[PDB]
Amino acid sequence: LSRYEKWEKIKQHYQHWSDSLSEEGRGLLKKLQIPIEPKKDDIIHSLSQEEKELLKRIQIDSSDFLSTEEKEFLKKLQIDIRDEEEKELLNRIQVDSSNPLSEKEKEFLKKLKLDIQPYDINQRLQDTGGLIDSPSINLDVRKQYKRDIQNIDALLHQSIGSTLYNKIYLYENMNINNLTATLGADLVDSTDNTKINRGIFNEFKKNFKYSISSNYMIVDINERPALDNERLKWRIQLSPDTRAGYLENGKLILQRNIGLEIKDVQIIKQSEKEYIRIDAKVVPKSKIDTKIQEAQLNINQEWNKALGLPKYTKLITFNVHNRYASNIVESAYLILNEWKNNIQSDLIKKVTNYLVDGNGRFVFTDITLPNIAEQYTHQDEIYEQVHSKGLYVPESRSILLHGPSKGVELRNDSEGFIHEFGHAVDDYAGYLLDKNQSDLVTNSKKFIDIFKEEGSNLTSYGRTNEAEFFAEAFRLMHSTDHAERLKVQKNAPKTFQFINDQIKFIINSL
Ligand SMILES: COc1cc(S(=O)(=O)N(CC(C)C)[C@@H](C(=O)NO)C(C)C)ccc1F
Ligand SMILES: [Zn+2]
């Protein structure tokens, strides 16, 4: 099987297309491949002296609303500042405490996020799932992405054809964290790095049957040796009418919005290390979408019955547009099951009914949360939008859960959902206290001073504020691990009784 003949044959098939490219269209393809990173120098020049100094001393990863996408970069910025016992001094008490950011530190970083975004077409498409009109970036840039994307679509018009499509395989190397940051960290076996956890290999395979590409895949004509963190090795078979373009050095750029059916996931050995080989076939995206919608329509009927709700209530939403599609759907089943088992039937029903009254949702998605309507329609200011693994939005009565990302020191998605449901509990309890102006029961006189005492007893993150504290306590009060529930009763007895109070108070309301 000749790599170089294969390469030359595909290149010829697109030779006219390549020679027909304007240098405008040529640069557009380059810009897509190599995103335009922000220039660190112009940024710091714009900062004031208080802000230059404040930037020195701030310990970044404490933040919860950034992406390390966005966090990577700010520390790259922080050293360029520090240009003589500086390094040791400014980075001394790092491990000493994971203390919460000050409110003046928060507000600063919340606005510095708007100035550090790279112009990355493929990233914009993946983050928004193709819904590029999402108001999570500046309108001018938003319009700029649109013009570029529409132009690139126009460039990719030549299908691979009836002849070549079933003669060739195309390959993509991928980081496991790009699909699941949570599972990825420990899918590489801990005792040996060159081998795959078998129970955790089966993990990834039971629930992966279909995939979606909402951006432009850039695939290799011949398989390229895996880099460091590239443990996944895709082998793609195109469909006859799959539109693609030739990129230099033996690559293809595929059209956006295509569907992939998983045909075989295996463990393979390549050069004395284990890899996950993924065999996939290009199918129409609309085919995958119908399966997602059937799964959404289905799971709602299961849960409308099990919750005593109207038969056609829209409670659970599958906002799925990316490469780990089916597991997002599959995990949502698992999450709501753990949620049913660890929380009393009557608490679940009455709070969920409350959410329905406000047209709320359980949103399971692989697109970032600032691009979820249940958040951004109530958050006009981008500097107030939040990305995190999960969120509860009172204004929309909705729980949002982002599949791919990793949680701030938390075991599984199921525990995090319970935490979010704890927020909805706070909301309803505060509503029952005063139906006229509904506030959070954690914004009540009683709980506030409870927080100033028992607040720094539970999880490191529960120290953030009243609302978060209530939620972490609620979660731990409902853990499968019987040990965890007792610590809450012992290390924070007033919070324990307070929550249990509200639980009683909720259930006994008529
Ligand atoms: C590990 O799984 C999850 C992780 C999170 S989270 O992003 O880490 N998180 C706090 C966690 C600990 C609940 C969020 C939160 O307070 N929502 O109420 C903040 C980021 C705002 C959320 C849901 C999950 F399922
Ligand atoms: Zn929270």
122 shares a domain with 109: no
Amino acid letter at 93?
I
CB 396 within 8 A of CB 374: yes
Q: Whose CA is nearest to atom 12 of ligand 1?
A: 408
Owning domain of residue 508: 285-510
CB 365 within 8 A of CB 328: yes
292 shares a domain with 278: no
Q: What does the DSSP assignment read for 237-303?
A: E--TT-BEEEETTTEEEEPSSEEEEEEEEEEEESSSSEEEEEEEEEE-HHHHHHHHHHHHHHHHHHH
Looking up tokens 């405008």 gives: 24
Q: Around ion ligand 2, which residues have CB less than 5 A away?
A: 468, 471
Alpha helices of 308-362 — where are they, by DSSP H? Answer: 325-341, 345-357
Question: Any binding-site annotation on 461?
Answer: yes
- What CATH number should be reported for the domain holding residue 226? 3.90.176.10
88 shares a domain with 69: yes
67 shares a domain with 33: no
- From ligand 1's centre to the CA of 416, what distance in Å? 6
Percentages of the chain per state (helix, strand, coil), in multiples of 5: 50, 15, 35
406 shares a domain with 338: yes
126 shares a domain with 184: yes
124 shares a domain with 85: no
Number of folded domains that form the chain: 3
- From ligand 2's centre to the CA of 308, what distance in Å? 27
Render the burial of 95-122: b for 16+ CB within 10 Å, e for the rest. Answer: eeeeebbeeebeebbbebbeebbeebbb
User: In Å, how far from its chain's centre is CA 58?
Assistant: 25
The ligand placed nearest to the CA atom of residue 392 is 1
Candidate of 388, 459, 468 to mutate for ligand 1, largest count of ligand atoms within 8 Å of Cβ = 388
Token output for 408: 């701030």
Domain boundary among 91, 117, 143: 117
Looking up tokens 């409350």 gives: 354
Resolution of the experimental model, in Å, one decimal:
2.7
- The closest of 285, 126, 277, 316 to 210, measured between CA atoms, is 285
Ligand 1 atom nearest residue 182's Cα: 1
Which residues sit with their C-beta closer than 6 Å to ligand 1?
64, 388-392, 401, 407-408, 410, 413, 416-417, 419-420, 423, 461, 468, 471
Q: Whose CA is nearest to atom 3 of ligand 1?
A: 416
Q: Three-state SS across 447-489?
A: HHHHHHHHCCCCCCHHHCCHHHHHHHHHHHCCCCCHHHHHHHH
End-to-end CA distance of the chain: 73
Question: Any binding-site annotation on 321?
Answer: no
User: Experimental technique used?
Assistant: X-ray
- From ligand 2's centre to the CA of 243, what distance in Å? 43
CB 449 within 8 A of CB 475: no
Q: What whole-number distance in Å separates Cα of residue 168 and Cα of residue 58?
A: 52
Looking up tokens 């398989």 gives: 223
Q: Which residues pair with 235 in a beta bridge?
A: 171, 279
Q: What whole-number distance in Å separates Cα of residue 425 and Cα of residue 431?
A: 10
Q: Which residues pair with 274 in a beta bridge?
A: 269
376 shares a domain with 261: no
The ligand placed nearest to the CA atom of residue 391 is 1
- The closest of 292, 260, 267, 170 to 219, measured between CA atoms, is 170
Host H or E run for residue 491: helix 482-491
Token output for 62: 């404490």
- What CATH number should be reported for the domain holding residue 382? 3.40.390.10
Looking up tokens 């599959």 gives: 330
Question: Any binding-site annotation on 415?
Answer: no
Domain boundary among 73, 90, 117: 117
Q: What whole-number distance in Å separates Cα of residue 292 and Cα of residue 298?
A: 10
Q: What whole-number distance in Å separates Cα of residue 21 and Cα of residue 248?
A: 13
Active site residue 420: yes
Alpha helices of 358-481 — where are they, by DSSP H? Answer: 373-376, 413-433, 445-454, 466-476
Amino acid letter at 287?
K
33 shares a domain with 61: no
| Cα separation values, 132 from 102, 215, 365, 459, Å | 33, 11, 16, 37
340 shares a domain with 274: no
- What CATH number should be reported for the domain holding residue 101? 1.10.2030.10
Biggest alpha carbon distance in the chain? Answer: 76
The ligand placed nearest to the CA atom of residue 407 is 1
Candidate of 106, 364, 375, 389 to mutate for ligand 1, largest count of ligand atoms within 8 Å of Cβ = 389
Token output for 154: 């126009």
Q: What whole-number distance in Å separates Cα of residue 44 and Cα of residue 292?
A: 45
173 shares a domain with 52: no
Token output for 56: 């020195």
Host H or E run for residue 11: helix 3-13
Render the burial of 198-237: b for 16+ CB within 10 Å, e for the rest. Answer: eeebeebbeebbbbbbbbbbbbbbbbeebeeebbbbbbbb
- From ligand 2's centre to the CA of 221, what distance in Å? 45
Q: What whole-number distance in Å separates Cα of residue 204 and Cα of residue 208?
A: 6
371 shares a domain with 344: yes
Domain boundary among 117, 149, 170: 117
CB 219 within 8 A of CB 188: no
Q: Is 80 helix (H, G, I), strand (E, B) or coil?
A: helix
Token output for 189: 């076996």
For residue 36, report the phi and psi dihedrals to the nearest 5 degrees: -85, 100
Question: Any binding-site annotation on 85?
Answer: no
- The closest of 309, 283, 170 to 236, measured between CA atoms, is 170
